[PDB]
Design an enzyme around this catalytic site. Structure first.
Site, PDB file in Angstrom:
ATOM      1  N   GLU A   1       0.783  -1.372   0.091  1.00  0.00           N
ATOM      2  CA  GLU A   1       0.158   0.030  -0.036  1.00  0.00           C
ATOM      3  C   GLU A   1       0.723   1.136  -0.137  1.00  0.00           C
ATOM      4  O   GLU A   1       0.481   2.408   0.676  1.00  0.00           O
ATOM      5  CB  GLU A   1      -0.893  -0.024   1.220  1.00  0.00           C
ATOM      6  CG  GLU A   1      -1.737  -1.059   1.380  1.00  0.00           C
ATOM      7  CD  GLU A   1      -2.935  -1.085   2.206  1.00  0.00           C
ATOM      8  OE1 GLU A   1      -2.918  -0.322   3.191  1.00  0.00           O
ATOM      9  OE2 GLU A   1      -4.086  -1.666   1.874  1.00  0.00           O
TER      10      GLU A   1
ATOM     11  N   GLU B 154      -4.664  -8.525  -0.438  1.00  0.00           N
ATOM     12  CA  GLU B 154      -5.389  -8.269   0.775  1.00  0.00           C
ATOM     13  C   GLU B 154      -6.915  -8.340   0.768  1.00  0.00           C
ATOM     14  O   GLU B 154      -7.282  -7.572  -0.214  1.00  0.00           O
ATOM     15  CB  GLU B 154      -4.655  -7.190   1.685  1.00  0.00           C
ATOM     16  CG  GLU B 154      -4.419  -7.241   2.904  1.00  0.00           C
ATOM     17  CD  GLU B 154      -3.987  -5.948   3.660  1.00  0.00           C
ATOM     18  OE1 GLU B 154      -2.654  -5.517   3.254  1.00  0.00           O
ATOM     19  OE2 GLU B 154      -4.728  -5.105   4.079  1.00  0.00           O
TER      20      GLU B 154
HETATM   21  O1  LIG Z   1      -8.096  -3.014   7.448  1.00  0.00           O
HETATM   22  C1  LIG Z   1      -6.824  -2.418   7.794  1.00  0.00           C
HETATM   23  C2  LIG Z   1      -5.445  -3.025   6.933  1.00  0.00           C
HETATM   24  C3  LIG Z   1      -5.475  -2.194   5.587  1.00  0.00           C
HETATM   25  N1  LIG Z   1      -4.239  -2.538   4.734  1.00  0.00           N
HETATM   26  C4  LIG Z   1      -3.061  -2.495   5.486  1.00  0.00           C
HETATM   27  C5  LIG Z   1      -3.087  -3.286   6.809  1.00  0.00           C
HETATM   28  O2  LIG Z   1      -1.804  -3.177   7.513  1.00  0.00           O
HETATM   29  C6  LIG Z   1      -4.060  -2.923   7.589  1.00  0.00           C
HETATM   30  O3  LIG Z   1      -4.052  -1.553   7.912  1.00  0.00           O
END
Ligand SMILES: OC[C@H]1CNC[C@@H](O)[C@H]1O
Length: 757
Positions: free
Chosen positions: A387, A464
């Site tokens: 991200e 994810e």
């Molecule tokens: O819903 C939270 C997740 C979003 N994507 C990164 C993760 O580390 C976590 O923060």
């Protein structure tokens, strides 16, 4: 002797002090008041998310052993969290900011033989340096390496398998040798490939010329006929023993664990040993809840075992390198791994994140990761980031991605690079997604079809997924906890049913990696994203995944059956069988066929084929679910009962026998039961624990995110009927370990754990 020994534990007998103190690196400093402990150690799990910043000092004082005279001596740290400085006898010899990559110090020049020596480590972890619980301390193992002056330096063997077939595999081996003498030499190398029973089944000879003061590399290969193929069902591991010789004399012995499997990918999917593989994956953070961040093999094994029971075949190491031990388990347990380096690059997500170090350290850290892990057969991708904000730098963000991807390709072309993208369409339109071999999407099932139209040549998977939240055994009908009906999450979240749906409609997608498999500690001090709670108890979400990802017939029912007369209870059943039938006190409430009788869920709404549902007016007693195949044959069943008042404690150890090593654990589930042995589904009774004999109290938990109970006091409240006691052996002490669990007004419980070796 230094020629036979391949690095021993240097974890024992340290001094620790939490806080700043002047001159504590000095030889003559007085650390006699300092606490005494063995590594690995997370100080942040002890204190009262949980505070993880400040200053921590470690010192170890040791005699220069006579056998280390004229040897090369190094200390390897697998992990120190974070901002490490290291001194030997007052001289600074090491400085390492990133807590997830390991580092090595050479103490050869400063080592005093037959006199006292002082190794000092200062950690200065900063606030706002992590979006999740990092721990604090020398949280991974430490190693002493005593070598002769011709030897294999760290990460000095690289094992690949460029041919893998049933009849024959070829094992290719690159050996690195360092010549610390003042003479040029030609050195012989003997590779012994050792099978699972300890028998040497092949020997490959090689050699290398290395000039004085220099390091050289050599490559050789050997055929393995009828190889034991490393695969998910049969994760067979070989052991490589590499011996270096200077004429007749052995100078060094170096072991490498490895497996024999081929991997391959196209735009249409991923392949293991010539077959399509799909990722039933989970993201996991490195903590183990009540056990904190200190490496513990059994804690990790248990976590991975529970994930394998859910149908998990794949792990994403969100968002950092894991411990070597964790990867050894993945190797041994047949799980494929996405090994992830960083959570940010040049642009900051948090004030003291990796962006402070990126320009100076990024190459060194990614290189260190690949050198450390490129022999694990579990690892199938190098994930360069998660991200990252460079996704939205339209002009130049792609250049940082290319930079990291090129290092992956230079160091290990046998595994693809990848990255986890949460912006859409930015990194796809900004030429970023194209710089790695395989593109991962975070939380974009609605865009799977479109991205394949626009960018048809990208290989894709869900890096994810979901981010659905729940608290174990909590239902809100019709908060501080979250409903275990698995509907709620942050703005980008969605229930698992949505991912399943879009995975089925987009077969090119290689799979998903859910956020998360286990709850983890944060900075409500901990998460709700886990399918399994922080102490290893499955939520209902576990069973939704198990229903989708395993073949062994099952059925699971929710909620509990302690409600008020007059309430209408929505009853959900998760099964992998053709249909299920619900029975209230013997009376049938109807069949429901999976894929036909759909359950409406609020996201506007979605008709889900992944849950079976009834609306039941609550009469108390017993609610029974029966799962059948399409012939009408009973394949599984579960019964839940309206429970009475709390009356007794039951203790259930996961393992009644453990190893007498001082590290191994028994995880004892603690149930609050009524007079007839039914679980009290909402009980929160304070339970007290006493541990006597061969072992000791280690930790407690209950999966409650919004409590401040210590993890390391011998007392814990139940949450939704249960809590969890963790005991640990004492080193070299065999016999009985006797547990007693008491609680005001309940029947006391006892159990024995036997400790061997
Ligand atoms: O819903 C939270 C997740 C979003 N994507 C990164 C993760 O580390 C976590 O923060």
């Amino acid at each position: 002797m230094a020629s036979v020994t391949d690095g021993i534990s240097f974890n024992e007998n340290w001094r620790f002090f939490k806080g700043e103190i002047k001159g504590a690196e000095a030889i003559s400093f007085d650390d006699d008041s300092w606490r005494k402990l063995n590594l690995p150690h997370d100080w942040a799990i002890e204190g009262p998310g949980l505070p993880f910043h400040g200053t921590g000092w470690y010192r170890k004082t040791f005699i220069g052993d006579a056998q280390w005279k004229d040897k090369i001596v190094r200390i390897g740290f697998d992990g120190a969290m974070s901002e490490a400085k290291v001194w030997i006898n007052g001289v600074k010899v090491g400085e390492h900011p990133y807590g997830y990559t390991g580092f090595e110090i050479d103490i050869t020049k400063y080592l005093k033989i037959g006199e006292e020596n002082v190794l000092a480590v200062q950690l200065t972890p900063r606030d706002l340096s992590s979006r999740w619980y990092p721990g604090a301390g020398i949280y991974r193992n430490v190693w002493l390496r005593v070598d002769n002056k011709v030897y294999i330096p760290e990460h000095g063997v690289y094992v690949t398998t460029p041919t893998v077939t049933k009849s024959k595999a070829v094992v290719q081996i690159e050996t690195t040798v360092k010549n610390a003498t003042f003479g040029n030499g030609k050195f012989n190398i003997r590779h012994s490939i050792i099978n699972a029973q300890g028998e040497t089944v092949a020997i490959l000879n090689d050699n290398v010329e290395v000039a004085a003061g220099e390091q050289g590399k050599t490559l050789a290969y050997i055929n393995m006929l009828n190889p034991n193929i490393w695969g998910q069902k049969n994760p067979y591991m070989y052991k490589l023993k590499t011996e270096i010789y200077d004429g007749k004399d052995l100078t060094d012995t170096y072991f490498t664990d490895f497996g024999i499997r081929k991997i391959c990918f196209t735009k249409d999917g991923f392949f293991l040993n010539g077959e399509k593989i799909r990722f039933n994956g989970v993201c996991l953070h490195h903590d183990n809840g009540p056990m904190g961040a200190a490496v513990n093999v059994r804690a990790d094994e248990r976590k991975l075992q529970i994930m394998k029971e859910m149908g998990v075949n794949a792990i994403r190491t969100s968002h950092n390198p894991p411990s070597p031990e964790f990867l050894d388990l993945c190797d041994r347990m047949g799980l494929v791994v996405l090994d992830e380096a960083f959570d940010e690059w040049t642009k900051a997500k948090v004030d003291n994140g990796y962006h402070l170090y990126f320009d100076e350290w990024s190459k060194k850290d990614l290189t260190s990761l690949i050198m450390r892990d490129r022999n694990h057969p579990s690892v199938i991708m190098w994930s360069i980031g998660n991200e990252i904000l460079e996704q939205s730098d339209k002009k130049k963000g792609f250049t940082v991605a290319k930079y990291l991807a090129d290092i992956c390709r230079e160091l290990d072309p046998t595994r693809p690079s990848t990255c986890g993208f949460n912006y859409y369409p930015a990194p796809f339109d900004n030429n970023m997604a194209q710089q790695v071999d395989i593109a991962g999407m975070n939380y974009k099932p609605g865009k799977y079809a479109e991205v394949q139209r626009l960018y048809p040549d990208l290989p894709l998977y869900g890096s994810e997924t979901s981010s659905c939240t729940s608290s174990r055994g909590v239902y809100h009908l019709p908060t501080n906890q979250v409903t275990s009906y698995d509907l709620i999450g942050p703005k980008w979240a969605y229930p698992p049913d949505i991912e399943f749906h879009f995975q089925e409609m987009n077969p090119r997608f290689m799979g998903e990696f859910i956020w998360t498999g286990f709850d983890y500690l944060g900075e409500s001090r901990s998460s709700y994203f886990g399918a399994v709670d922080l102490c290893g108890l499955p939520k209902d979400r576990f069973y939704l995944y198990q229903s989708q990802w395993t073949d062994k017939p099952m059925v699971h029912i929710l909620p509990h059956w302690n409600w008020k007369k007059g309430m209408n209870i929505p009853v959900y059943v998760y099964t992998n069988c053709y249909e299920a039938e619900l029975f209230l006190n013997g009376k049938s409430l109807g069949k429901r066929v999976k894929g036909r009788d759909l359950t409406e869920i609020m996201v506007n709404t979605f008709q889900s084929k992944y849950r079976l549902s009834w609306d039941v007016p609550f009469e108390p007693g017993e609610l029974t679910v029966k799962a059948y195949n399409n012939l009408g044959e009973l394949k599984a069943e579960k019964t839940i009962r309206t429970a009475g008042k709390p009356a007794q404690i039951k203790l259930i150890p996961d393992r009644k026998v453990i190893t007498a090593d001082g590290k191994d654990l028994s995880y004892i589930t603690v149930r609050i039961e009524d007079r007839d042995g039914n679980l009290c589904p909402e009980a929160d009774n304070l339970v007290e624990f006493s541990v006597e004999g061969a072992g000791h109290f280690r930790a407690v938990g209950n999966g409650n995110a919004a409590t401040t109970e210590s993890f390391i006091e011998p007392k814990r409240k139940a949450f939704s009927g249960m809590c969890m006691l963790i005991v640990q052996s004492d080193e070299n002490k065999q016999g009985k370990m006797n547990i007693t669990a008491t609680s005001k007004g309940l029947k006391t419980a006892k159990t024995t754990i036997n400790v061997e070796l």
